[PDB]
């Protein structure tokens, strides 16, 4: 996270760190959506361009963490991957359209003050919360600037951007399955996701029921917090029909 602050304790009980077995390291970030499933971006698990095609027997998931590097005994929880599901129409060859994937945990994970599931929006909730101007939240142990690292989870609030504005900040092709956020060049403000925040959750709390909803997945960017450039996220709700498909079918 570029230009953030340290996550307050338990502030994001749904944040999940994607960990590599060997060599031990941080691959990406993700979110907890129930004791058995975790959500993340699809290029964190598969990306031919870099010869990436991880198998469940290659990585673990650390839930309820705060310290990036320390093993947080009696707080965080490490679970093993049962099975991995990547959206079938995930286009990595071009613009990472449908950058999303689901992780089925080997065994349920006990909730606590540091581990709790985030809500997924509904057509209605998405309808009234997903609007330019409104701010959302992004969390992770990703880089602080382009090119050190955070010692503790980082938090940042960002305002969503209008379709046109997002469209015109890049040469890359934007699809409806994605939206962008970030402060405008002249709003005179800085902040963004960065290396390692991938899969990260972009959330907002409905002022109606006071609950937090994950509206998007930290998907891709062109640098971190560059003027004129915006950060892109996987439009969660627009793909929830698929999520529900794999979940209710393959156990829940």
């Amino acid at each position: 996270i570029v230009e953030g602050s340290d996550a307050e304790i338990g502030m994001s009980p749904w944040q999940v760190m994607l960990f590599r077995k060997s060599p031990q390291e941080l691959l990406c970030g993700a979110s907890l959506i129930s004791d058995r499933w975790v959500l993340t971006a699809a290029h964190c698990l598969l990306y031919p361009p870099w010869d990436k095609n991880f198998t469940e027997n290659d990585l673990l998931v650390r839930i309820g963490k705060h310290s990036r590097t320390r093993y947080e005994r009696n707080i965080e929880k490490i679970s093993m991957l049962e099975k991995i599901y990547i959206h079938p129409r995930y286009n990595w060859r071009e613009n990472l359209d449908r950058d999303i994937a689901l992780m089925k945990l080997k065994k349920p994970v006990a909730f606590s003050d540091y581990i709790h599931p985030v809500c997924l929006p509904d057509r209605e909730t998405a309808a009234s919360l997903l609007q330019a101007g409104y701010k959302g939240r992004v969390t992770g142990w990703g880089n602080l600037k382009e090119t050190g690292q955070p010692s503790v989870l980082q938090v940042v609030n960002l305002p969503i951007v209008e379709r046109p504005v997002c469209k015109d900040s890049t040469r890359i092709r934007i699809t409806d399955n994605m939206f962008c956020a970030g402060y405008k060049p002249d709003e005179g403000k800085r902040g963004d996701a960065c290396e390692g925040d991938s899969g990260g959750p972009f959330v907002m709390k409905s002022p109606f029921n006071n609950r937090w909803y994950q509206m998007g997945i930290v998907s891709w960017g062109e640098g971190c917090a560059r003027k004129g450039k915006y950060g892109f996220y996987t439009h969660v709700f627009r793909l929830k029909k698929w999520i529900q498909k794999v979940i209710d079918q393959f156990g829940e």
Binding site: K21, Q24, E25, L26, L60, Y71
Partner: peptide, 10 residues
């Protein structure tokens, strides 16, 4: 850089 985690978890 990342502190070792439990043998069991492997």
């Amino acid at each position: 850089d990342f502190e070792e985690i439990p043998g069991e978890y492997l």
